[PDB]
Design a protein around this ligand. Structure first.
Ligand SMILES: O[C@@H]1[C@@H](O)[C@H](O[C@@H]2CO[C@@H](O[C@@H]3CO[C@@H](O[C@@H]4CO[C@H](O)[C@H](O)[C@H]4O)[C@H](O)[C@H]3O)[C@H](O)[C@H]2O)OC[C@H]1O
Length: 324
């Protein structure tokens, strides 16, 4: 059971930015404590998995929007905005995209893969626009996810192998053409560490924006750890923000490296407080902060862990109280 009388988390940040959360469609019923926690504390929602490519077009032409729509219906019912995650990735994407349909032992051509990407993006954005219209809660999409490798080069996924480096620009062009009302993001992890990947994200967005690619924002996943350096996060935000794009913290959680002791929870609270003070300080750039999961028991990190503000019993942790 949840604590009904403690402060609604997002309300603490109303003069700064929406606070959202990634959810599973099976945790949205009124009587479910995870759904109670979701509606109480967040004013923004993201599908943890239901809007990924395999979740929306498992086989060619066979679109499966029921789970995504269940999440959108819930967001509408609770007056929450949404982020769309994600139109292109190298995981949770079906193999059929990359196969020649007459000979599945061979790869699709550059033109066929680009056409498939255009059809997927356009169908996905047109589905939400035609079904929900002005009530569509989605304000933007992660158009491409994790396109850099950890050395800062372009990740050599099947998209890069078949099409070449301009597949990124093309995804943005297709999404902008389908729905020019959506803010378009490039999303990635490790770009908060102020290392080679941060520099590479800055370089790639600088280049694509100067070429007229309609990129509106950079999504910083923020899968940080109990040992993360706040100074590196602040320097990454400043560097990426200098491009004149919005910054959203899209998938925040904290890896405890197996240490879930009471001492570690107190260290986690001090670090989360510093992190949120930094986000507030950078409110002129940051337009959303989203946690990657509702509570520790449903976090995607392997066990043992304690990554979020609500524990495995759905209770507020020391980090919740430090932030509010
Ligand atoms: O048919 C069933 C399968 O579909 C099911 O497969 C599961 C699907 O969930 C995978 O875990 C997900 C991996 O993505 C994580 O989100 C990432 C987090 O990192 C970045 O922020 C990134 O941008 C996000 O997309 C999700 O949090 C996580 O749930 C899982 O690995 C896979 O096995 O398996 C069972 C079948 O019945």
């Amino acid at each position: 059971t949840i604590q009904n009388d403690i402060p609604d988390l997002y309300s603490v940040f109303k003069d700064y930015f929406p606070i959202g959360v990634a959810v599973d469609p099976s945790r949205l019923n009124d009587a479910d404590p995870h759904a109670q926690l979701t509606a109480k504390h967040f004013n923004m929602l993201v599908a943890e998995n239901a809007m990924k490519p395999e979740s929306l077009q498992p086989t060619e032409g066979n679109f499966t929007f029921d789970n995504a729509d269940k999440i959108v219906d819930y967001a509408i019912a609770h007056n929450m905005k949404m982020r769309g995650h994600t139109l292109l990735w190298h995981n949770q994407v079906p193999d059929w995209f990359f196969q020649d349909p007459s000979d599945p032992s061979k790869p699709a051509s550059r033109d066929l893969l680009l056409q498939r990407l255009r059809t997927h993006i356009t169908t996905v954005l047109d589905h939400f626009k035609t079904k929900y219209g002005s009530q569509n809660p989605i304000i933007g999409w992660d158009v491409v996810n994790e396109v850099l490798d950890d050395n800062g080069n372009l990740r050599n996924s099947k998209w890069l192998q078949i099409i070449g480096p301009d597949y990124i620009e093309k995804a943005f062009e297709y999404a902008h053409e389908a729905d020019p009302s959506m803010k378009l993001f490039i999303n990635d992890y490790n770009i908060e560490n102020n290392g080679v990947k941060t520099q590479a994200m800055y370089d790639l967005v600088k280049k694509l924006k100067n070429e007229g690619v309609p990129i509106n924002g950079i999504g910083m996943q923020m899968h940080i750890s109990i040992n993360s350096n706040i100074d590196n996060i602040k320097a990454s935000i400043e560097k990426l923000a200098s491009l004149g794009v919005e910054i959203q913290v899209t998938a925040l959680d904290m890896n405890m490296n197996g240490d879930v002791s009471n001492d570690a929870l107190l260290k986690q609270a001090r670090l989360y407080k510093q992190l949120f003070d930094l986000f507030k300080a950078e409110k002129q750039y940051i337009t959303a902060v989203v946690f990657w999961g509702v509570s520790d028991d449903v976090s995607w990190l392997s066990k043992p862990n304690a990554p979020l503000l609500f524990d495995s019993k759905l209770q507020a942790k020391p980090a919740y109280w430090a932030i509010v």
